[PDB]
Symmetry: C3
Subunit: 113 residues, 3 copies
């Protein structure tokens, strides 16, 4: 099992969300964050101004899936979230040792099906 954490542009939420639902994702969590991602020598454009290290609003998507579904999920997010301008986002994949469904106590594969 893996956790996929994707930082995306806020306006992209709808476009990304539809891609994931159509791909068969059945659970996801979203939160509001702020961030910077300043590659060397670049500025990020937002509403007609250029930024270096100021924090900009982003959204964090969290999706826990079976290992065999990670690449599909990654591909769907990338294709829907990208624009070609710096600031499009970043995805981090991390291990999940156990998953538990609260209502039933189901575990692991059963809790993500």
């Amino acid at each position: 099992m893996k956790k996929i954490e994707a930082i995306i542009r806020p306006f992209k939420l709808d476009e990304v969300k539809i891609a994931l639902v159509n791909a068969g994702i059945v659970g996801m969590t979203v939160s509001e964050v702020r961030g910077f991602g300043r590659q060397k020598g670049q500025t990020e454009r937002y509403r007609g101004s250029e930024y270096t290290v100021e924090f900009l609003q982003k959204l964090k998507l969290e999706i826990v899936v079976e290992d065999a579904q990670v690449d599909t999920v990654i591909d769907k997010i990338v294709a829907a979230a990208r624009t070609g301008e710096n600031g499009d986002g970043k995805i981090f994949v991390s291990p999940v040792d156990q998953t538990i469904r609260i209502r039933t106590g189901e575990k692991n594969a059963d809790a993500i099906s």
Copy 2:
């Protein structure tokens, strides 16, 4: 060391929190999130309406503990957070390689005691 991340119903915060404090948990983090968890063919009830993939408000609890305490923490959350209606929540356990207490620089077991 493990991180326990629990997504719960917002109203349950107090009921869950009291269970964990009584069990001896000494540190926890809470954040506001939104989410869906649509098992196939189901709808989630909220304030008299039925939802499919709309995002609903949830809370994310994060608790870092020693390995030997994980199952106790899981049990306390499940028992306090559940209601029997879909939407009760989900728990993800993940590895923590190092913990550092900022004030003192204490590490690992010392930083979670």
Copy 3:
């Protein structure tokens, strides 16, 4: 690759942020959380009152770096965030299996450079 998650006092954001930018960090994410950290028998001071398990506002910083940069990042956060009063914060380091830059599809070391 590792994720560094640091819970800090909200007022410290600026002091911590400047330390990390000067150390060469190029990406970070911040979120608003609440928390308690009650070591046995202690109270946390906030705006002239003493707290046990009430939730206090904190900030969560998330920084994904190469393994060889973790200790530098940890040191910079600790030195900038600390005050000597309980409630200064806690840092959790966890594994990241894959990183993807959304705009380009670059992976891993390429996505964090």
